[PDB]
Enzyme design. Structure first.
Site, short mmCIF file in Angstrom:
data_model
loop_
_atom_site.label_atom_id
_atom_site.label_comp_id
_atom_site.label_asym_id
_atom_site.label_seq_id
_atom_site.Cartn_x
_atom_site.Cartn_y
_atom_site.Cartn_z
N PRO A 85 15.25 -3.53 -3.43
CA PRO A 85 14.81 -4.89 -3.09
C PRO A 85 13.31 -5.08 -2.96
O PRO A 85 12.84 -6.21 -3.17
CB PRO A 85 15.53 -5.18 -1.77
CG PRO A 85 16.73 -4.32 -1.79
CD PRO A 85 16.30 -3.05 -2.53
N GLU A 86 12.56 -4.06 -2.57
CA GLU A 86 11.11 -4.21 -2.44
C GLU A 86 10.42 -4.38 -3.78
O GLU A 86 9.25 -4.80 -3.81
CB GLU A 86 10.52 -3.02 -1.71
CG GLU A 86 11.11 -2.83 -0.32
CD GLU A 86 12.19 -1.70 -0.33
OE1 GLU A 86 13.26 -1.74 -1.09
OE2 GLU A 86 11.90 -0.77 0.48
N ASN A 87 11.09 -4.02 -4.88
CA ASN A 87 10.51 -4.07 -6.20
C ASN A 87 11.02 -5.26 -7.00
O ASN A 87 10.82 -5.32 -8.23
CB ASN A 87 10.79 -2.76 -6.93
CG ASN A 87 10.02 -1.62 -6.35
OD1 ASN A 87 9.10 -1.83 -5.54
ND2 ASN A 87 10.35 -0.42 -6.78
N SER A 116 0.71 5.95 -1.09
CA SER A 116 -0.04 7.19 -0.97
C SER A 116 -1.11 7.36 -2.04
O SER A 116 -2.02 8.19 -1.87
CB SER A 116 0.91 8.39 -1.02
OG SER A 116 1.65 8.37 -2.22
N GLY A 126 -2.06 4.25 -4.16
CA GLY A 126 -2.42 2.96 -4.71
C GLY A 126 -2.15 1.86 -3.72
O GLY A 126 -1.61 2.07 -2.62
N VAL A 138 -1.55 -2.80 -3.90
CA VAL A 138 -1.50 -4.03 -4.66
C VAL A 138 -2.26 -5.08 -3.87
O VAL A 138 -1.99 -5.28 -2.68
CB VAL A 138 -0.05 -4.49 -4.96
CG1 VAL A 138 -0.04 -5.83 -5.66
CG2 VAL A 138 0.69 -3.44 -5.76
N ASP A 158 13.35 2.77 -10.48
CA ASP A 158 12.95 2.43 -9.12
C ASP A 158 13.55 1.10 -8.67
O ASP A 158 12.90 0.32 -7.97
CB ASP A 158 11.43 2.44 -8.95
CG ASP A 158 11.01 2.79 -7.51
OD1 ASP A 158 9.83 2.58 -7.19
OD2 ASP A 158 11.88 3.22 -6.70
N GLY A 212 7.47 -13.60 -2.63
CA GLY A 212 7.72 -12.41 -1.89
C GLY A 212 8.83 -11.55 -2.43
O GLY A 212 9.51 -11.87 -3.39
N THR A 214 13.75 6.49 -4.98
CA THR A 214 13.80 6.28 -3.54
C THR A 214 15.13 6.83 -3.04
O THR A 214 16.17 6.57 -3.67
CB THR A 214 13.72 4.76 -3.30
OG1 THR A 214 12.50 4.23 -3.87
CG2 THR A 214 13.77 4.47 -1.82
N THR A 250 0.84 -1.19 0.00
CA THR A 250 0.00 0.00 0.00
C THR A 250 0.88 1.24 0.00
O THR A 250 1.98 1.22 0.53
CB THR A 250 -0.99 -0.06 1.19
OG1 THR A 250 -2.13 0.79 0.92
CG2 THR A 250 -0.32 0.34 2.46
N1 LIG Z 1 6.55 -4.14 -4.52
C1 LIG Z 1 5.90 -5.43 -4.89
C2 LIG Z 1 4.43 -5.25 -5.26
O1 LIG Z 1 3.72 -4.90 -4.07
C3 LIG Z 1 3.86 -6.51 -5.89
C4 LIG Z 1 3.57 -7.65 -5.14
C5 LIG Z 1 3.23 -8.84 -5.75
C6 LIG Z 1 3.16 -8.92 -7.13
O2 LIG Z 1 2.94 -10.11 -7.79
C7 LIG Z 1 3.41 -7.77 -7.90
O3 LIG Z 1 3.33 -7.88 -9.24
C8 LIG Z 1 3.75 -6.58 -7.28
#
Ligand SMILES: [NH3+]C[C@H](O)c1ccc(O)c(O)c1
Length: 340
Positions: free
Chosen positions: A159-161, A43, A45, A47, A156, A116, A191, A41
């Site tokens: 690691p979170e992406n 500001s 959007g 997922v 962007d 993940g 970032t 989550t």
């Molecule tokens: N930063 C990852 C994003 O929240 C996300 C999580 C799972 C997914 O399959 C995705 O395409 C994107």
């Protein structure tokens, strides 16, 4: 450059351009899906994990609130994101399966990768060994070779992406800052820890910012923490622009050398932005053991396989307050998002 790589990239660009010029639109609707769990989550959007009611397939549905996109000046970025995602095709990029809009929201329905974020795994283990970091880095190098050849900048990397798939390979998500750029672009985005100096200094910048970000990522994977960190962004930025970076003693000499060339403050001297392009990176000694073709073909055994029970398992993602997906009875921001 072997003619085989040239011809691969020429066909890749042809295929991208055909979809770029004639984008797909309106290929599903919200009531084709059941909502399962919020996976992330922000500001403007979220997922969500969803399940398609007829096929049973799971997807990650990115939901953007049109009014918030407008307020936070993300209109062009959201249009970039969808137009690019519907046009690209590479083994290490998450695929866009559907997109649509309604009175309130924009929707991008992506593949769901149950393993993940790399971020979680990195923090759980502490740091990755050099072979493990190298396996992921090689995939990013090939992905950037692909994207940059299409005149795309990603903007962007972190690691979170990066998601870890069922085979242990990388899937790049989060195209919200990606843009088709011939030459330079100017938007302040990214970032803080990953920003190149030329972004911080408000210059016209190019694909070299992605190669800088790769240096940050490789450092972070191998050390467990990024090279430039501080309690406030301004202090991070001072460190980034300084030209100084310290390396843990456990880093190999080859790793330090690669990183000094990716984390090169002078963009005109940075690996990935010189006359030999990506090949200065691919031919570096740190990558001597890398079989680029085998990585592309996904024939290399991965360093680890995430633990999960099936395509709907969410245990590798974290817990967020579950909020409604509300759709106004009145259309919002129709003109702004006409092309979506
Ligand atoms: N930063 C990852 C994003 O929240 C996300 C999580 C799972 C997914 O399959 C995705 O395409 C994107």
């Amino acid at each position: 450059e072997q003619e085989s790589v040239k011809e691969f990239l020429a066909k890749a660009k042809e295929e991208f351009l055909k979809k770029w010029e004639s984008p797909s639109q309106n290929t599903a609707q919200l009531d084709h899906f059941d909502r399962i769990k919020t996976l992330g989550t922000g500001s403007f959007g979220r997922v969500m994990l969803v399940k398609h009611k007829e096929t049973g397939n799971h997807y990650a549905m990115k939901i953007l609130d049109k009014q918030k996109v407008v307020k936070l000046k993300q209109i062009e970025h959201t249009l970039n994101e969808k137009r690019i995602l519907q046009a690209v095709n590479f083994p290490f990029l998450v695929k866009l399966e559907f997109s649509f809009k309604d009175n309130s929201n924009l929707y991008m329905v992506m593949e769901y990768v149950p393993g993940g974020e790399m971020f979680s795994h990195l923090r759980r283990i502490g740091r990755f060994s050099e072979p493990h970091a190298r396996f992921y880095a090689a995939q990013i190098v090939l992905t950037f070779e692909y994207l940059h050849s299409l005149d795309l900048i990603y903007r962007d990397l972190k690691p979170e992406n990066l998601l870890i798939d069922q085979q242990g390979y990388i899937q790049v998500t989060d195209f919200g800052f990606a843009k088709r750029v011939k030459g330079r672009t100017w938007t302040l985005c990214g970032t803080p820890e990953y920003l190149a100096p030329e972004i911080i200094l408000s210059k016209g910048y190019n694909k070299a910012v992605d190669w800088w970000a790769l240096g940050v990522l490789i450092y972070e994977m191998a050390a467990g923490y990024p090279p430039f960190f501080a309690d406030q962004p301004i202090q991070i930025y001072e460190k980034i622009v300084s030209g100084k970076v310290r390396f843990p003693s456990h880093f190999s000499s080859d790793l330090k050398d690669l990183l000094r060339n990716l984390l090169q403050v002078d963009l005109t001297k940075r690996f990935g932005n010189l006359k030999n392009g990506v090949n200065d990176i691919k031919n570096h000694k740190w990558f001597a053991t890398t079989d680029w073709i085998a990585i592309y073909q996904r024939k290399v055994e991965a360093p680890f396989i995430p633990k999960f029970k099936g395509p709907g398992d969410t245990s590798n993602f974290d817990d967020y307050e579950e909020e409604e997906i509300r759709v106004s009875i009145n259309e919002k921001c129709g003109k702004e998002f006409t092309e979506f």
